[PDB]
């Protein structure tokens, strides 16, 4: 069988998971109580009385957001032992989430994951949702990833992260946590997807015509992307591509594994009409520099490989025509050592609409994941911020009072520099 | 779960605390008798932060009231909400401090601090997970300054891994009621700068200015001042007892706001503030709250932020609002006023959003700031201290209790070093 | 001015059987290359270096200066099994194996035995430790929470510390042994608290009626610990946190002094407050960092070299 285990660590991860699991329940016809009045085994397991329990683990060092989950409208969906909470949070500190407060609920989450993995035959991989720049999402994720790599090893790990934006920011100590966690995510992850909130704000404003968005809209978009990724495992169609095929067609060298995601069409109900919304029109919109979910224009870079995923009413002839038209253009550059740079997948299941949402009922959609050399701009900005703050050694006393030496900062900065010089040298 | 123990010292602290407890009880729907008459579950969801349960659905605050005279005690006990406090938590003596720092720190406060520590230790061992301590006092008096300083030292020695935040009323330049205020203020800062995690600076002059100008009040009394202070105290820790889109705790605010250990002196603020008869003409939106918060004439400390640069700013929001608007406002505030922010720290602002507004409002916000303009307060206190200390005036009231001139010189040097620390980043 | 020296040690027989490899490559006389990364110091010794050369290039000028009424400070940083004790104690009686402290006392008393008869000398010795941010006296265990105060000339000092008179090198060695008997040591012989030694040499000329006072500080620092790779729980973790914070504060003070900063944060730790008079101004301070060339100890050597480089 084909099954996935999802981990939602931190506030951002828990909220994204709320969106994701509402979406999956609506997709598979499962009521919030686990009763539906075989396409769900990837994300649900039967209990013998008709109830379905998600293969999810929710983690946080603070008892607040998980408590909202525990008394909300999905309180009878989750196993009470899957939602794990602590006493005091990491307080925007990597070290607190890594060791001092991390080494208290780590064994519990490990035991829960081991229990979940034993109840599934064909494990396919892990789906980890967290946030760079926080305490728990950066520190507890490093420890969790280290142990899982030690324990399971051969299974794939896919990470969905929130990266700091170039201008908009929430915390003051975000660069430190981001640098340390991006040093941790190189060795243990197998494929990393980064999305920043500023790009999604821009997408919401321009396309959906909402002037005052909140976190819920962002989480709905991210859930749509993840569902498009897992549709091939869940449902059936022509040219279905699973996790290992994505990895073997998207990662040229072992360290170059940081793709950029995009979705199309993000249209409103009013503008849903008055538009053809064909295969070619959807495909062309996935290469525009304003529809990217990271603040980086791919025109300042070269593509290496891209995997295109179609769900709905799509025919392969149209995909071939769209690929040919994209290949004709000049503003889109491909590296000279990848003459064939596309992986095509089609699924017959159209996207599902959620009540009380902004997206319109479309008949087809795409989700392009591409790894370019243009992903090194955001890293450069974050490194500049980090070095500016670290020259004066501000806020470093908070990190060393929790058992962290002062050489970790230099080591992580060196690792980031090495990674950037790789993405530059492989580009040429 | 993240409980806070509250201590009130002196007349000013006790009165501010009484107003604070009335406000908090109103927010949580608690009757004066200790009963619950609310209308929502979120009121009772996190009541353990500030209240202790009792038999038959009764709630007693986790407050400890300490003084050297019984007059404030029996003024508080007979008020509207005097029946809510535990009678065993009133600790008082009979001979007052007499506006003497030395007396309350060495002679009379030493014979009363064992009882206060006993009640604190009993109260703190009944907590499932302690988060920190709160102290309300005044630096310019005798019992507040000396006794609160001694209590802070003892508590920090006992619990060294906990938050200690204080709301200290600081002597004002143009408004004064004591002749020996500079001595007490200096000797109190000399200890606050070492045994505290984050101290909020308040002065009566700024509160009077707010009341006279913004609120258009005719005859303000201490009730209004204590009410403003209680509003900011409630706003600081709103994320410890209600849900929200972004959560910030006390340790989070300390981590983001304190770059170096000494620099932990803040100037609070609140929004909205309008006058009756002028609320119908004003629209309440996030831009209005942001505009009022960063105004120089809204801070509760008698310092002008334009005479200095912000090191960090913390903004805590209450209500239903968009995150895009908050981020945009907090970015354009820095972009438009780049000359008032430190250059080597990007993103000087931290944002927290809670989803339950104060009763009777749609939106609200509290402002915590860390600016180099706080150095002028210490400069005025030091000027007055040196003027009075050259002649050794009023100094035999202190050396008669067991003090020394070397203590005065050490406190002066510590204040000067703090001023030199802040002046570097200007 | 601040001088930073780095001394290495030869690989011992107990680790020559494990096939451990030398990692250090020496360029000239002021650099060491580890993992293809240069590390520049004022002078870098090698394994063939002798004790006398270390004394002549590290502590002779300070000893001569203190005798002229000035002040000086000598630090000593290293991980366990890195040569710290050999470089700053060595064989207590071997003329070719003695370290820095016995040589200093030898020179200081050879000066007295050769300076006329109109000069009177008195030597004061203090010895205390800093454990969990608390000053403790190693010559009298009764005192455990001493405090730091100031005199009229804002020169900080420790109030209540035991200060005893000595008249021969044997007495100084005896008091050093007595002090080391009560230092907090982990279960091979790892130190968990900083140790400070004060030798006060005051001379008064009877004829000219001129008085000179000099204080010499010898600090034995504890090493930083990476907690995530050790598994610290309980008191060990608290000690590790305190040590890391104190070492970072000392680095901040030294960097501020070297970069010519207007403000030097002497008040961010107990230790830097004590040494306010003997660190800045016209005082000579040297830092001796000891490392090992084994491949098994690459990370600790890197940490020590980085701490030494922080001084600059
Ligand atoms: C019709 C209407 O909207 O009336 C408002 C009002 O007019 C204004 C002017 C209120 C009013 O406040 C004052 O006049 C005031 C008096 C003394 C000290 C400080 C303020 C108000 O009294 C105060 C009151 O505030 C609250 O209800 C908050 O929950 C507040 N409550 C208390 O302070 C409180 C008072 C008595 C008993 C128990 C609690 C609060 C604020 C922060 C944290 C917790 C609670 C409000 C909105 C109003 C009135 C009634 C006129 C203002 O104050 C507050 C704290 O909201 C003054 O500027 C604001 C703006 C408001 O619009
Ligand atoms: N998309 C999305 N991003 C969020 C959300 N909440 C916080 N973030 C982002 O996450 C970062 C802050 O990290 P958090 O996840 O809130 O912190 P944490 O992981 O809970 O760690 P601690 O609270 O410090 O213990 C900021 O960049 C926020 O913009 C959310 O609900 N949705
Ligand atoms: N806000 C407020 N300030 C007060 C109150 N009473 C006194 N103060 C201020 O506190 C300072 C005097 O200290 P006080 O507390 O009266 O002396 P103590 O009783 O010995 O601690 C002066 O600056 C007063 O303006 C009060 O009820 N409310
Ligand atoms: N530079 C050196 N040359 C020769 N031997 C050395 C040197 N440094 C250390 N040793 C040997 O190491 C042994 C123990 O070292 P020690 O002083 O205990 O280090 P630490 O105190 O850091 O554990 C000594 O017996 C000494 O012979
Ligand atoms: Mg959180």
Q: What is the 3-state secondary structure (H, E, C) of B33-92?
A: CCCECCCCHHHHHCHHHCEEEECCCEEEECEEEEECCHHHHHHHHCCCCHHHCCHHHEEE
Asked whether residue B52 is marked as a ligand-binding residue, the answer is: no
Structure tokens at A12: 């951002």
Q: By C-alpha distance, which of C246, C270, C258 is closest to C77? A: C246
Give B272 Cα–ligand 1 centroid separation in angstroms: 9
Structure tokens at A327: 């290949």
Q: By C-alpha distance, which of A307, A292, A278, A280 is closest to A207? A: A292
Nearest by CB to B325, from A93, A212, A391: name it: A212
Distant-in-sequence, close-in-space partners of B412: CB < 8 Å, separation ≥ 6: B186, B382, B385, B386, B389
Element (H, E) at C252: helix C235-258
CA torsion through residues C145, C151, C154, C157, sign: negative
- Please confirm whether the linkage preceding B372 is cis (ω < 30° from 0): no
Gap between the Cα atoms of A39 and A227, Å rounded: 13
Gap between the Cα atoms of C168 and B173, Å rounded: 61
What CATH number does the domain containing A382 carry?
Answer: 1.10.287.600
Distant-in-sequence, close-in-space partners of A104: CB < 8 Å, separation ≥ 6: A86
Do A170 and A44 lie in one domain? The reply is: yes
Structure tokens at C22: 């030398």
Q: Is any ligand 1 atom within 6 A of the Cβ of residue B359?
A: yes
Domains and CATH numbers, chain B: 2-259 (3.40.50.1440), 260-373 (3.30.1330.20), 374-426 (1.10.287.600)
Gap between the Cα atoms of A226 and A209, Å rounded: 23
Gap between the Cα atoms of B48 and B52, Å rounded: 6
Q: By C-alpha distance, which of A25, A132, A60, A111 is closest to A68? A: A60
DSSP label at A299? G
The CA–CA distances, whole Å, from B185 to B16, B171, B188, C274 equal 19, 7, 5, 26
Give B314 Cα–ligand 1 centroid separation in angstroms: 22
Q: Is any ligand 3 atom within 6 A of the Cβ of residue B120?
A: no
What CATH number does the domain containing C23 carry?
Answer: 3.40.850.10
Q: By C-alpha distance, which of A299, A278, A280 is closest to A288? A: A299
What CATH number does the domain containing A354 carry?
Answer: 3.30.1330.20
Query: Largest alpha-carbon pair distance within chain B?
Result: 63
Gap between the Cα atoms of A264 and C288, Å rounded: 63
Distant-in-sequence, close-in-space partners of B54: CB < 8 Å, separation ≥ 6: B34, B60
Q: How many CB pairs under 8 A join B and C?
A: 20
Q: What is the 3-state secondary structure (H, E, C) of C26-46?
A: EECCCEEECCCCEEECCEECC
Structure tokens at C67: 């005798």
Question: Residues A374, A301: contact at Cβ < 8 Å?
Answer: yes
Work out whether strand B163-169 and strand A342-347 pair parallel, antiparallel, or are unpaired: unpaired
The CA–CA distances, whole Å, from C227 to A181, A255, A402, B320 equal 17, 28, 9, 42
Do A271 and A284 lie in one domain? The reply is: yes
Question: Residues B86, B62: contact at Cβ < 8 Å?
Answer: no
Question: Residues B206, B269: contact at Cβ < 8 Å?
Answer: no
Residue C275 burial by Cβ neighbours in a 10 Å radius (0-12, 13-18, 19+)? buried
Q: Which of A200, A227, A259 is the last residue of a domain?
A: A259
Gap between the Cα atoms of A112 and B90, Å rounded: 49
User: In chain C, how many domains are there?
Assistant: 1
Distant-in-sequence, close-in-space partners of A118: CB < 8 Å, separation ≥ 6: none
A234–chain C Cβ distance below 8 A for any pair: no
CA torsion through residues B403, B407, B412, B415, sign: negative
Do A8 and A42 lie in one domain? The reply is: yes
Gap between the Cα atoms of B44 and B35, Å rounded: 12
Query: Which residues are registered as beta bridge partners of C130?
Result: C135, C194
Q: By C-alpha distance, which of C297, C299, C285, C310 is closest to C58? A: C285
Q: Long-range contacts: B79-83, Cβ < 8 Å, 24+?
A: B79/B18, B80/B22, B80/B32, B81/B18, B81/B21, B81/B22, B81/B25, B81/B32, B82/B18, B83/B32, B83/B33, B83/B34
Please give the angle made by the CA atoms of B336, B340 and B345, to the nearest 5 degrees. Answer: 95
User: In chain A, how many domains are there?
Assistant: 3
Gap between the Cα atoms of B286 and C33, Å rounded: 57
Query: In this complex, do B344 and A92 lie within 8 Å of one another by their Cβ atoms?
Result: no
Q: Is any ligand 3 atom within 6 A of the Cβ of residue B72?
A: no
> Which residues from chain C sit within 8 angstroms of residue A406, using beta carbons?
224, 244, 248, 251, 306-307, 310
Most A CBs within 10 A among B320, B347, B363, B370, hence the mutation to make, goes to B347
For residue A317, the number of C-alpha atoms closer than 13 Å in the C-beta half-sphere is 0
Question: Residues B84, B25: contact at Cβ < 8 Å?
Answer: yes
For residue A140, the number of C-alpha atoms closer than 13 Å in the C-beta half-sphere is 38
Structure tokens at B225: 């001042």
Do A165 and A45 lie in one domain? The reply is: yes
Q: By C-alpha distance, which of A197, A305, A198 is closest to A257? A: A305
Q: How was this structure determined?
A: cryo-EM
Give B353 Cα–ligand 5 centroid separation in angstroms: 12
Query: In this complex, do A403 and C240 lie within 8 Å of one another by their Cβ atoms?
Result: yes
Query: In this complex, do C263 and B420 lie within 8 Å of one another by their Cβ atoms?
Result: yes
Gap between the Cα atoms of B22 and B19, Å rounded: 5
Question: Residues B116, B91: contact at Cβ < 8 Å?
Answer: yes
3-state secondary structure of C9: coil
Q: Got the DSSP string for A171-208?
A: -SSHHHHHHHHHHHHHHH-SEEEEE-HHHHHHHIIIII
Total Cβ atoms within 10 A of residue A16: 26
Gap between the Cα atoms of B408 and A340, Å rounded: 80
Do A340 and A401 lie in one domain? The reply is: no
Structure tokens at B83: 């029946």
Q: Is C131 left (phi over 0), alpha (psi -120 to 50) or beta?
A: beta
Distant-in-sequence, close-in-space partners of B118: CB < 8 Å, separation ≥ 6: none
What CATH number does the domain containing A172 carry?
Answer: 3.40.50.1440
3-state secondary structure of C244: helix
Question: Residues A368, A303: contact at Cβ < 8 Å?
Answer: no
Residue nearest ligand 3's atom 12 by CA: B141
Main-chain phi, psi angles of A218, to 5 degrees? -60, -45
For residue B254, the number of C-alpha atoms closer than 13 Å in the C-beta half-sphere is 23
Q: Got the DSSP string for C36-101?
A: S-EEE-SEE--TT--HHHHHHHHTHHHHHHHTTT--EEEEEEE-TTSSHHHHTTB-SS-TTTB-SH
Asked whether residue B247 is marked as a ligand-binding residue, the answer is: no
Do A228 and A275 lie in one domain? The reply is: no
A225-A229-A232-A234 Cα dihedral, nearest 10 degrees: -70
Work out whether strand C194-205 and strand C72-78 pair parallel, antiparallel, or are unpaired: unpaired
Total Cβ atoms within 10 A of residue C257: 19
Structure tokens at C103: 């040589």
Query: Largest alpha-carbon pair distance within chain C?
Result: 66
Total Cβ atoms within 10 A of residue C31: 14
Please give the sequence-ordered ranges of beta strands (E in DSSP) within A210-301, or none if there are none. Answer: 260-264
Please give the sequence-ordered ranges of beta strands (E in DSSP) within A337-418, or none if there are none. Answer: 342-347, 364-372
Question: Residues B265, B199: contact at Cβ < 8 Å?
Answer: yes
Distant-in-sequence, close-in-space partners of C263: CB < 8 Å, separation ≥ 6: B420, B421, B424, C256
DSSP label at A69? H
Structure tokens at B426: 């200007």
Question: Residues B305, B296: contact at Cβ < 8 Å?
Answer: yes
Q: Got the DSSP string for B190-226?
A: HHHHHH-SEEEEE-HHHHHHHHHHTS--SS--HHHHH
Query: In this complex, do C237 and A397 lie within 8 Å of one another by their Cβ atoms?
Result: no
Do A239 and A316 lie in one domain? The reply is: no
Q: Is A303 left (phi over 0), alpha (psi -120 to 50) or beta?
A: beta
Work out whether strand B58-61 and strand B63-67 pair parallel, antiparallel, or are unpaired: unpaired
Gap between the Cα atoms of A99 and A112, Å rounded: 20
Distant-in-sequence, close-in-space partners of A92: CB < 8 Å, separation ≥ 6: A134, A135, A171, A173, A177, B252, B255, B256
The CA–CA distances, whole Å, from A106 to A95, A140, B360, B425, C112 equal 14, 8, 43, 42, 64
**Which residue of chain B has the CA closest to A199?**
B324
Gap between the Cα atoms of A310 and A372, Å rounded: 21
Q: Which domain holds residue C22?
A: 2-311
Distant-in-sequence, close-in-space partners of A102: CB < 8 Å, separation ≥ 6: A96, A139, A140, A143
Residue whose tokens read 């200390």: B389
Element (H, E) at B8: strand B3-9
C225–chain A Cβ distance below 8 A for any pair: yes
Question: Residues B346, A388: contact at Cβ < 8 Å?
Answer: yes
Give B253 Cα–ligand 5 centroid separation in angstroms: 12
Gap between the Cα atoms of B142 and B101, Å rounded: 5
Element (H, E) at A320: helix A316-328
Give C81 Cα–ligand 4 centroid separation in angstroms: 7
B100-B101-B102-B103 Cα dihedral, nearest 10 degrees: 50
Q: Which residues of B317-350 are buried (b: 16+ CB within 10 A; e: fewer)?
A: bbbebbbbbbbbbbbebbeeeeebbbeebbbbbb
The CA–CA distances, whole Å, from B73 to A121, B9, B87, B120, B147 equal 70, 11, 11, 18, 16
Distant-in-sequence, close-in-space partners of B56: CB < 8 Å, separation ≥ 6: none
The CA–CA distances, whole Å, from C8 to C20, C43, C84, C213 equal 15, 12, 10, 35
> Which residues from chain A sit within 8 angstroms of residue B324, using beta carbons?
201, 204, 212-214
Q: Which domain holds residue A426?
A: 375-428
3-state secondary structure of B136: strand
Main-chain phi, psi angles of B417, to 5 degrees? -65, -35
Separation of CA B269 from chain center = 11
* Residues of chain B that touch chain A, judged by Cβ-Cβ distance less than 8 Å: 1-2, 45, 129, 131, 243, 245-247, 249, 251-252, 254-261, 312, 322-325, 327-328, 331, 344-351
Question: Residues B415, B382: contact at Cβ < 8 Å?
Answer: yes
Q: Is any ligand 1 atom within 6 A of the Cβ of residue B274?
A: yes
Work out whether strand B58-61 and strand B51-54 pair parallel, antiparallel, or are unpaired: antiparallel
Q: Is any ligand 1 atom within 6 A of the Cβ of residue B23?
A: yes
B424–chain C Cβ distance below 8 A for any pair: yes
Q: Which of A213, A235, A259 is the last residue of a domain?
A: A259
Residue whose tokens read 């990674």: A419
Gap between the Cα atoms of C51 and B175, Å rounded: 68
Question: Residues C275, C73: contact at Cβ < 8 Å?
Answer: yes
Q: Is A389 left (phi over 0), alpha (psi -120 to 50) or beta?
A: alpha
Residue A331 burial by Cβ neighbours in a 10 Å radius (0-12, 13-18, 19+)? exposed
Gap between the Cα atoms of A68 and B356, Å rounded: 14
Asked whether residue B25 is marked as a ligand-binding residue, the answer is: no
Separation of CA C266 from chain center = 18
Structure tokens at B12: 């000013």
Do A264 and A150 lie in one domain? The reply is: no
Distant-in-sequence, close-in-space partners of A100: CB < 8 Å, separation ≥ 6: A402, A403, C237
Distant-in-sequence, close-in-space partners of A364: CB < 8 Å, separation ≥ 6: A277, A279, A282, A310, A311, A312, A313, A314, A350
Gap between the Cα atoms of B156 and B193, Å rounded: 13
Residue whose tokens read 């100094």: B395
Gap between the Cα atoms of B261 and B174, Å rounded: 31
Distant-in-sequence, close-in-space partners of A140: CB < 8 Å, separation ≥ 6: A9, A10, A59, A61, A90, A97, A98, A102, A106
Question: Residues A69, A62: contact at Cβ < 8 Å?
Answer: no
Q: Is any ligand 3 atom within 6 A of the Cβ of residue B319?
A: no
> At how many Å resolution was this determined?
2.9
Question: Residues B262, B421: contact at Cβ < 8 Å?
Answer: yes
A residues 328-387 lying closer than 8 A (beta carbon) to B = 385
């Amino acid at each position: 069988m084909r099954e996935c285990i999802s981990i939602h660590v931190g506030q951002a991860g828990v909220q994204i998971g709320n969106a994701c699991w509402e979406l999956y329940c609506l997709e598979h016809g499962i009521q919030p109580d686990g009763q539906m009045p075989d396409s769900f085994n990837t994300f649900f397991s039967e209990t013998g009385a008709g109830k379905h329990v998600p293969r999810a683990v929710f983690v946080d060092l603070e008892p607040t957001v998980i408590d909202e989950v525990r008394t909300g409208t999905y309180r009878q969906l989750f196993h009470p032992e899957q939602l794990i909470t602590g006493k005091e949070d990491a307080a925007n500190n990597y070290a607190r989430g890594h060791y001092t407060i991390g080494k208290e609920i780590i064994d519990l989450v490990l035991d829960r994951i081991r229990k979940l993995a034993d109840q599934c035959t064909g494990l396919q991989g892990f789906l980890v949702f967290h946030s760079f720049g926080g305490g728990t999402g950066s520190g507890f994720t490093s420890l969790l990833m280290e142990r899982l790599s030690v324990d399971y090893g051969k299974k794939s790990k896919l990470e969905f992260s929130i990266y700091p934006a170039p201008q908009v920011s929430t915390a003051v100590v975000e660069p430190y946590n981001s640098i340390l966690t991006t040093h941790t995510t190189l060795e243990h992850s197998d494929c990393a997807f980064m999305v920043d909130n500023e790009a999604i704000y821009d997408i919401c404003r321009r396309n959906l015509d909402i002037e005052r968005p909140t976190y819920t809209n962002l989480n709905r978009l991210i859930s749509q992307i993840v569902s498009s990724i897992t549709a091939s495992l869940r449902f059936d169609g022509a040219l279905n591509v699973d996790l290992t095929e994505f990895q073997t067609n998207l990662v040229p060298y072992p360290r170059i594994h940081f793709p950029l995601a995009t979705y199309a069409p993000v249209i409103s109900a009013e503008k849903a009409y008055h538009e053809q919304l064909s295969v070619a029109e959807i495909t062309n919109a996935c290469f525009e520099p304003a529809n990217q979910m990271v603040k980086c224009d791919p025109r300042h870079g070269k593509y290496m490989a891209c995997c295109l995923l179609y769900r709905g009413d799509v025919v392969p002839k149209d995909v071939n025509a769209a690929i040919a038209t994209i290949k004709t253009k000049r503003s889109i550059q491909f590296v000279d050592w990848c003459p064939t740079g596309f992986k095509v997948g089609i699924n017959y299941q159209p996207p599902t609409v959620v009540p009380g949402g902004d997206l319109a009922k479309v008949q087809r959609a795409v989700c392009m994941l591409s790894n370019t050399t243009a992903i090194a701009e955001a890293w450069a900005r974050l490194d500049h911020k980090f070095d500016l703050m670290y020259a004066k050694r501000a806020f470093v006393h908070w990190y060393v009072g929790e058992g962290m030496e002062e050489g970790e900062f230099s080591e992580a900065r060196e690792d980031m520099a090495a990674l950037e010089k790789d993405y530059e040298e492989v580009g040429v | 779960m993240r409980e806070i123990v509250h201590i009130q010292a002196g007349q000013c602290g006790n009165q501010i605390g009484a107003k604070f407890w009335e406000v908090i009880s109103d927010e949580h729907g608690i009757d004066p008798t200790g009963s619950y008459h609310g209308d929502s579950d979120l009121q009772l969801e996190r009541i353990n932060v500030y209240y202790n349960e009792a038999a038959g659905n009764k709630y007693v605050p986790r407050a400890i009231l300490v003084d050297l005279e019984p007059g404030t005690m029996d003024s508080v006990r007979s008020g509207p909400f005097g029946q809510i406090f535990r009678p065993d938590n009133f600790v008082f003596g009979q001979s007052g401090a007499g506006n003497n720092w030395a007396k309350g720190h060495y002679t009379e406060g030493a014979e009363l601090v064992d009882s206060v520590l006993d009640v604190v230790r009993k109260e703190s061992e009944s907590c499932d997970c302690l988060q920190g301590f709160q102290l309300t006092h005044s630096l310019g008096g005798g019992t507040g300054s000396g006794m609160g300083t001694l209590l802070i030292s003892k508590i920090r020695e006992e619990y060294p891994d906990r938050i200690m935040n204080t709301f200290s009323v600081v002597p004002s330049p143009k408004v004064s009621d004591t002749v020996v205020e500079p001595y007490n203020a200096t000797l109190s800062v000399h200890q606050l700068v070492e045994n505290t995690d984050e101290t909020y600076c308040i002065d009566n002059e700024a509160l009077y200015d707010i009341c006279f100008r913004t609120l258009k009040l005719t005859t303000p009394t201490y009730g209004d001042l204590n009410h403003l202070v209680s509003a900011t105290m409630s706003g600081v820790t709103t994320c410890l007892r209600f849900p929200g889109q972004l959560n910030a705790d006390l340790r989070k605010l300390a981590v983001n706001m304190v770059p170096f250990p000494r620099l932990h002196f803040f100037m609070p603020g609140f929004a909205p503030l309008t006058s009756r008869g002028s609320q119908q003409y004003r629209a309440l939106t996030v831009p209005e709250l942001t505009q009022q918060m960063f105004d120089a004439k809204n801070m509760m400390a008698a310092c002008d932020p334009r005479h200095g640069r912000y090191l960090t700013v913390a903004a805590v929001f209450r209500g239903r609002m968009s995150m895009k608007e908050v981020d945009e406002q907090m970015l354009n505030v820095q972009n438009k006023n780049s000359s008032y922010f430190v250059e080597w720290i990007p993103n000087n602002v931290k944002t927290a959003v809670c989803d339950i507004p104060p009763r009777g409002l749609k939106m609200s916000a509290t402002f915590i700031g860390n600016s180099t303009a706080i150095q002028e307060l210490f400069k005025r206190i030091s000027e007055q201290f040196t003027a009075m200390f050259r002649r050794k005036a009023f100094l035999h009231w202190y050396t008669g209790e067991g003090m020394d001139e070397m203590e005065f010189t050490e406190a002066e040097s510590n204040m000067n070093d703090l001023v030199s620390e802040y002046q570097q980043y200007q | 001015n601040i001088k930073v020296m780095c001394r290495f040690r030869p690989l011992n027989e107990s680790e020559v059987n494990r096939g451990d490899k030398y990692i250090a490559k020496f360029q000239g006389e002021d650099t060491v290359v580890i993992a293809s990364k240069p590390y520049a110091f004022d002078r870098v010794f090698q394994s063939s270096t002798s004790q006398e050369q270390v004394y002549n290039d590290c502590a002779k000028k300070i000893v001569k200066d203190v005798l002229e009424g000035y002040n000086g400070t000598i630090f000593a940083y290293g991980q366990t099994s890195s040569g710290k004790t050999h470089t700053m104690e060595g064989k207590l009686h071997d003329p070719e194996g003695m370290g820095i402290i016995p040589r200093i006392v030898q020179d200081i008393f050879n000066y007295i035995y050769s300076m006329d008869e109109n000069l009177e000398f008195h030597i004061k010795v203090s010895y205390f430790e800093i454990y969990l941010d608390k000053i403790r006296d190693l010559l009298d265990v009764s005192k455990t929470n001493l405090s730091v105060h100031e005199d009229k000339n804002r020169v900080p000092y420790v109030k209540g510390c035991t200060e005893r008179f000595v008249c021969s090198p044997d007495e100084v060695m005896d008091t050093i042994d007595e002090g080391k008997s009560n230092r907090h040591v982990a279960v091979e012989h790892s130190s968990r608290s900083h140790s400070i030694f004060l030798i006060n040499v005051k001379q008064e000329n009877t004829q000219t009626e001129q008085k000179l006072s000099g204080k010499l500080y010898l600090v034995d620092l504890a090493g930083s610990e990476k907690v995530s790779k050790t598994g610290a729980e309980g008191a060990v973790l608290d000690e590790a946190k305190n040590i890391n914070k104190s070492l970072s504060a000392l680095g901040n003070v030294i960097s501020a002094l070297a970069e010519g900063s207007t403000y030097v944060p002497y008040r961010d730790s107990k230790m830097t407050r004590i040494l306010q008079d003997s660190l800045g101004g016209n005082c000579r301070t040297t830092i001796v960092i000891c490392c090992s060339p084994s491949s098994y100890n690459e990370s600790e050597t890197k940490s020590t070299l980085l701490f030494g480089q922080r001084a600059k």
